[PDB]
Curated annotation (Swiss-Prot):
Domain of life the protein comes from: Bacteria
Disulfide linkage: none
Catalytic residues, chain numbering: R29, E37, R75
Region of interest: Disordered: 109-129
Residues that coordinate or bind Ca(2+): D15, D34, T35
Gene designation per UniProt: nuc
Basic and acidic residues bias spans: 109-125
Cell compartment(s), UniProt: Secreted
Span of the entire protein shown here: 89 to 223 of 231
Protein name: Nuclease A
Gene source species: Staphylococcus aureus
């Protein structure tokens, strides 16, 4: 897998973000994670977390997996990196997202995220308290 440049357009919530990719605006949905909707418990905290992470980054990168790059809603499906730190992984680590939507084509970083989830559960963080 390889990392591609991209620029913040707008934070949306815990696991979606509007980015410019190859000069085009696009909504990206984070692979392998599920944050609560904003109207749910830890929803605002998740939105806030992803927001600080992408807004404070000097460099945002997009990294597609091996399968699907676009979902049925036309959202890009990717691992997003903020100055070298994976947002997907950081949300899980903090117990602000659960590992989810693990599909056969796009699961490269699955073990790494379940590792972070076990560790966040161990600490009873946010979702897991
Ligand atoms: C994370 C992810 C979600 N999706 C689809 C499945 C879900 O369909 P349904 O809407 O039919 O339940 C939806 C959930 O996304 P949200 O969690 O952002 O709503 O997005 C994918 O197709 N691929 C993916 O990698
Ligand atoms: Ca969600």
């Amino acid at each position: 897998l390889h990392k591609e440049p991209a620029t913040l357009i707008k934070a949306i919530d815990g696991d979606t973000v509007k980015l410019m990719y190859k000069g085009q605006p696009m909504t990206f949905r984070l692979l392998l994670v599920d944050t609560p909707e904003f109207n749910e418990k830890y929803g605002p905290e998740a939105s806030a977390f992803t927001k600080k992470m992408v807004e404070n980054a000097k460099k945002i990168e997009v990294e597609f997996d091996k399968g699907q790059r676009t979902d049925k809603y036309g959202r890009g499906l990717a691992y997003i990196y903020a100055d070298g730190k994976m947002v997907n992984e950081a949300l899980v680590r903090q117990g602000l997202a659960k590992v989810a939507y693990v599909y056969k084509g796009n699961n490269t970083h699955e073990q790494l995220l379940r590792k972070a989830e076990a560790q966040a559960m161990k600490e009873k963080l946010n979702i897991w308290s």
